[PDB]
From a paper:
The Staphylococcus aureus pathogenicity islands (SaPIs) are the prototypical members of the phage-inducible chromosomal island (PICI) family of mobile genetic elements. Stl is a DNA-binding protein that binds to the intergenic promoter region between stl and str (the SaPI transcription rightward regulator), preventing transcription of the str and downstream genes, thus maintaining integration of the island in the host chromosome. The remarkable ability of the SaPIbov1 Stl to target unrelated but functionally similar antirepressor proteins relies on the modularity of this repressor. In this way, SaPIbov1 Stl presents three domains: one corresponds to an HTH N-terminal domain required to recognize and bind the divergent stl-str region present in the SaPI genome; a second (middle) domain responsible for interacting with the trimeric Duts, while the C-terminal part of the protein recognizes the dimeric Duts.
Therefore, we determined to solve the structure of BovI-Stl by eliminating this region and dividing the protein into two functional and complementary portions corresponding to the N-terminal (BovI-StlN-ter; residues 1–156) and to the C-terminal part of the protein (BovI-StlC-ter; residues 175–267). Likewise, we solved the structure of BovI-StlC-ter to 2.2 Å resolution. Nine residues (230–238) that correspond to a loop connecting α11–α12 were disordered, as well the three initial residues and the last one. The dimerization is mediated by the reciprocal interaction of the N-terminal part of helices α11 and α13, expanding the bundle from three to six helices. Around 800 Å2 of total surface area would be buried per monomer upon BovI-StlC-ter dimerization, suggesting a stable dimer that was confirmed by size exclusion chromatography (SEC) analysis. Mixed hydrophobic and hydrophilic interactions, including a double salt bridge between E189 and R253, are present in the dimer interface.
Author numbering: 178 to 227, 240 to 266
């Protein structure tokens, strides 16, 4: 019942978050907000899809997002 457009859109947003610059404090504030919405969207898909594919969206991408988050928290101190 998960559509390809929901999967495509999630990954599109993820890609944009990753390609983002993070040079200024404003950018970092925005990226962090975006990370939170991506975690939520990943887990939404993961729960709806139910190595099995669903584990990537339930666990792996939220873990990678958390990683990127800590890093961005590393700069802004």
């Amino acid at each position: 019942e998960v559509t390809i457009e929901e999967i495509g859109e999630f990954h599109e947003k993820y890609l944009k978050l990753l390609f983002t610059n993070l040079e200024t404090h404003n950018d970092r504030k925005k990226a962090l907000a975006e990370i939170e919405k991506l975690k939520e969207e990943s887990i939404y898909l993961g729960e709806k899809l139910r190595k099995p594919m669903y584990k990537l969206y339930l666990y792996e991408y939220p873990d990678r997002l958390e990683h990127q988050k800590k890093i961005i928290l590393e700069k802004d101190t």
